[PDB]
Structures are given as structure tokens and as C-alpha cells.
Amino acid sequence: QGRKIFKVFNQDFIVDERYTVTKELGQGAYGIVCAAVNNQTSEGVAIKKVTNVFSKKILAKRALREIKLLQHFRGHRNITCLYDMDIPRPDNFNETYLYEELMECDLAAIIRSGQPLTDAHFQSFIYQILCGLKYIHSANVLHRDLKPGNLLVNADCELKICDFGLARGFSVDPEENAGYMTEYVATRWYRAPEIMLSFQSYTKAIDVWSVGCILAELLGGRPFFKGRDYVDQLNQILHILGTPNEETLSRIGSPRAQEYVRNLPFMAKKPFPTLFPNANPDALDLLDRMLAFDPSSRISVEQALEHPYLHIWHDASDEPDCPTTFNFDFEVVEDVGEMRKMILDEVYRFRQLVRTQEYVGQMNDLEAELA
Ligand SMILES: Nc1ncnc2c1ncn2[C@@H]1O[C@H](COP(=O)(O)O)[C@@H](O)[C@H]1O
């Protein structure tokens, strides 16, 4: 066997025999999470059990999507790092276990606790998000669901992006781009406006908007655009940013939505210095550029990394790209028998993998020479 059984969240939890489960960490619609300790090296790990993966066709394509993407982004300082995977009962399995680097809480919890944070904290948090996002975008991947709940933090307040279940491809070819699949809908409070206004402009700007929502939530201690439905969400956004111009209005690809926005009374822009009168002026200037209503005027990731707000942290020699792009050919598969085969292949191939001029060089060549 080589495995142990634990009882957590009123179910079974089958782990490698080298570990001991220690604490429950939470639930979701997609699995349960516990913390553990390697009884040998003493390092801590988190163990995530994806549940009921072959109950619906959409849960199965979600798990395969997350498995492949976590492998593609291993080894970045600002992305959660996958260590191992395991399928305990391969004959009739309906779950897979992921072994990941262990963190302490998420950013939503820190904001909820009311613990005081300085402006240097805001700078560090926003810079780390942008470094991880630049890596992801360089592989032509859109995250699509950035928010404080998907950002893990530890005691040193280092930050790591997680949860790739909603990610989607991007291509400069608009026929290629129009063909990437979107199984689920993102969290309403952080979703960019051009998605519900039918701009047909699914670009990397959709992730930049979410980062702006996060900086605004940090500055006010509470979510910034907090709609109860989509109409309420649109009203709260126009109330802050104001009536759009004629170019922007014509871009609304939906007739009922364009008719509604065109008929509202005039609304002036509320300047961010009036909403956060005690904040760093550089913070509000970057906030204004990330929360641009029209995606064509919105700041890019690389422009944001160069903004004066972040000049202490910025070092382009420390902000890498991903070596290769990610391929989304698997999402075409629509047979659940094929998807069980692909998942088994991913796990066994990964398990085998993880178990496998400067001055000194110039002087070594000169020494072997003189000798
Ligand atoms: N690598 C990790 N380290 C520590 N806690 C985590 C980790 N991944 C997820 N969690 C937490 O486990 C819970 C489950 O979240 P979910 O990703 O929705 O299943 C949430 O409270 C997360 O913040």
C-alpha cells in the first residue's frame, strides 16, 4: 500500500505514508484542503483533494484544466508551486490528490481581520500580483478570476496566485480567440465591464481591471464595486467613473444595454482623491489607470510595473517571462472516457519527473593556461 487513511470533513483522505495530516483548511464546490507535515524532512505541505471529478462533464474538464496549468507554471516565486500528485484507487477513482507548497491564509482573510496595513504593504502586494500575472500572460493564458480569495499569503507577507480552474486562452488571431472555451462565470464584483457590455474584446485588459478592484479594496478596507446583480453592478460602476463618451457608447454590442446607458442622466466622474483623501497620491494615479472604463485606454501589465508607485520594487532583470506558450487543444475533447485516460496520463508522467562571462570561469581558463 504505502498510504494512510484519515477522516476529514466527514470523508476519507488517502495520503502518502510519509505525511501526517494536521489541520482542516476549508471546503469548496470542487474539493477539500488540509495541511500536513512530512514526518521525515519536517517541511509542511498542503494537500488538496479534488472531489467528484467524474460526476459531470464540466467538473472533469475543470480538473484536467487545473492539473495541466499548475504543471506549466511550476517554479515562479509568485505562483503556487505543485510538488506531487497521486490517484489512490486507480481502478474506480473519482478523486485526485495534489501536493502543494503550504501557505497560512488568503488576502481576503487579512482584509477581514482589520489588521492595520501600511502603504508599503499595498505596494508589495500589488507588485507581486503583477509579476505573477506577467508570467501567466507571456504564455498566452488569461486567469479570469483574480480576487483577494485567490491570493495566498504567509507570515513574511509573500504572495502567490492560485486557482486556475477558470483560465482561458488568448490569441492575437480573433478567430482563434473567439474559439477558446469558458465553462464558468467569474465573480461578479471583480469582472471587467466590457464582458457584460458585449464589447467582443476579450483581451488581457480583463485581468488588469481585477487588479484595480483589489487595490481599491485595500485602500478602503471593503469591496469597491459591490453589486447584488448585473444591473446593480453596472449602476455602481457608472456612478464612480461617469458617463462614457460617444466612441465608447457605440462599442456596446448589446442593443438593450446600449439603450439603457444612453438614456441615463448625466454623471460626473468622482475623483479618487475625494474618495480616499488620506492615500498616497501615486497610488491613486495608478488606480485611475487600472480602472479605465474602456479597455483601449487601460494600462498594461508592463506599463504598470514601471509606474512611479512601484519604483522601489521594480527590477526588470528580476521579472521573467514564461519560456513556452500553453496549448489548449485538450478542451476540444468531449468524451468522459477519454478524459479519464488523459488525467491518468498526466499524473503518472508527473510523478516520474519529480523523482529524478563570469570571473571564476575567466580565471580558471587563465590558470589551466599558465600551468
Ligand atoms: N496551498 C495552500 N496553503 C494553505 N491554504 C490553502 C492552500 N490552498 C488553498 N488553501 C485554503 O484552503 C481553502 C480551500 O479553498 P478552495 O481553493 O476554494 O478549495 C481556502 O481557505 C484556501 O485559502
- Tell me which residue has cell 508570467: 135
Phi-psi region of 26 (alpha: psi -120 to 50; beta: other; left: phi over 0): left
Our answer on whether the CB atom of 46 is closer than 6 Å to any ligand 1 atom is yes
Our answer on whether the CB atom of 33 is closer than 6 Å to any ligand 1 atom is yes
What distance in Å separates the CA atoms of residue 284 and residue 271, rounded to the nearest whole number?
9
> Is 253:200 a contact under the CB 8 Å cutoff?
yes
Query: Cell triple for residue 2?
Result: 504505502
Query: H or E element: which one contains 225?
Result: none
Our answer on whether the CB atom of 145 is closer than 6 Å to any ligand 1 atom is no
Distant-in-sequence, close-in-space partners of 67: CB < 8 Å, separation ≥ 6: 85, 96, 98, 343, 346, 347
- Write out the E strands in the chain: 3-8, 11-16, 19-27, 31-38, 44-50, 82-86, 96-101, 105-106, 141-142, 151-153, 159-161, 168-169
Q: What are phi and psi of 82, to 5 degrees?
A: -85, 130
> Is 103:152 a contact under the CB 8 Å cutoff?
yes
For atom 6 of ligand 1, the residue with the nearest CA is 103
What distance in Å separates the CA atoms of residue 64 and residue 14, rounded to the nearest whole number?
20
Distant-in-sequence, close-in-space partners of 237: CB < 8 Å, separation ≥ 6: 193, 225, 293
Helix (H, G, I), strand (E, B) or coil at 226: coil
What distance in Å separates the CA atoms of residue 22 and residue 242, rounded to the nearest whole number?
51
> Is 164:144 a contact under the CB 8 Å cutoff?
no
Q: How far apart are the first and last CA of the chain?
A: 59
Of 23, 25, 6, 24, the closest CA to residue 15 belongs to 6
Domains of the chain in start order, with CATH, are 3-102 (3.30.200.20), 105-318 (1.10.510.10)
Is the CA virtual torsion 287, 290, 293, 298 positive or negative?
A: positive
Substitution site in 21, 25, 27, 45 for ligand 1 pocket (most atoms within 8 Å of beta carbon): 25
Output the DSSP codes for 118-131.
-HHHHHHHHHHHHH
**What is the Å distance from ligand 1's center to 217 Cα?**
21
Experimental approach:
X-ray
Our answer on whether the CB atom of 32 is closer than 6 Å to any ligand 1 atom is no
**What is the Å distance from ligand 1's center to 44 Cα?**
14
For residue 15, the cross-strand partners are: 4
Q: How far is CA 145 from CA 44, 101, 163, 166, 338, in A?
A: 27, 21, 8, 7, 28
Chain centroid to CA 150: how far?
A: 6
Chain centroid to CA 9: how far?
A: 26
> Is 288:101 a contact under the CB 8 Å cutoff?
no
> Is 124:175 a contact under the CB 8 Å cutoff?
no
Output the DSSP codes for 319-360.
-PPPSS----GGGG---HHHHHHHHHHHHHHHHHHHT---HH
Q: Tell me which long-range contacts 281-285 makes (C-beta under 8 A, separation of at least 24).
A: 282/307, 282/308, 282/309, 283/119, 283/122, 283/123, 283/215, 283/219, 283/309, 285/309
Our answer on whether the CB atom of 28 is closer than 6 Å to any ligand 1 atom is yes
Substitution site in 8, 30, 32, 33 for ligand 1 pocket (most atoms within 8 Å of beta carbon): 33
Our answer on whether the CB atom of 85 is closer than 6 Å to any ligand 1 atom is no
Distant-in-sequence, close-in-space partners of 136: CB < 8 Å, separation ≥ 6: 73, 79, 142, 143, 161, 322
Our answer on whether the CB atom of 31 is closer than 6 Å to any ligand 1 atom is yes
For atom 11 of ligand 1, the residue with the nearest CA is 25
**For the chain, percent helix, then strand, then coil, each to nearest 5?**
45, 15, 40
Chain centroid to CA 290: how far?
A: 17
Chain centroid to CA 259: how far?
A: 34
Our answer on whether the CB atom of 286 is closer than 6 Å to any ligand 1 atom is no
Of 110, 271, 97, 133, the closest CA to residue 208 belongs to 133
Distant-in-sequence, close-in-space partners of 224: CB < 8 Å, separation ≥ 6: 189, 213, 216, 217
Nearest-atom index, ligand 1, CA of 80 = 1
For atom 23 of ligand 1, the residue with the nearest CA is 106
Q: How far is CA 197 from CA 35, 248, 334, in A?
A: 42, 11, 30
Is the CA virtual torsion 36, 39, 44, 49 positive or negative?
A: negative
For residue 16, the cross-strand partners are: 3
Query: Cell triple for residue 292?
Result: 479605465
Our answer on whether the CB atom of 103 is closer than 6 Å to any ligand 1 atom is yes
Q: Which amino acids are annotated as binding site for ATP, given as ranges?
A: 25-33, 48
**Interruptions in the chain after residues (C–N over 2.5 Å):** 356
> Is 134:321 a contact under the CB 8 Å cutoff?
yes
The overall longest dimension of the chain from CA atoms, in Å, is 87
What distance in Å separates the CA atoms of residue 234 and residue 264, rounded to the nearest whole number?
12
**What is the Å distance from ligand 1's center to 148 Cα?**
12
**What is the Å distance from ligand 1's center to 81 Cα?**
13
Is the CA virtual torsion 355, 356, 358, 361 positive or negative?
A: positive
Query: Cell triple for residue 362?
Result: 575567466
Supply angle C-alpha 95, 96, 101, rounded to 5.
140
Nearest-atom index, ligand 1, CA of 109 = 23
Strand 31-38 versus strand 11-16 pairing type? unpaired
Q: How far is CA 348 from CA 207, 338, 352, in A?
A: 33, 16, 6
DSSP secondary structure code for residue 188 in this structure = G
> Is 304:120 a contact under the CB 8 Å cutoff?
no
Q: How far is CA 201 from CA 163, 217, 257, 310, in A?
A: 24, 26, 16, 29
For residue 20, the cross-strand partners are: 37
> At what resolution in Å was this solved?
2.3
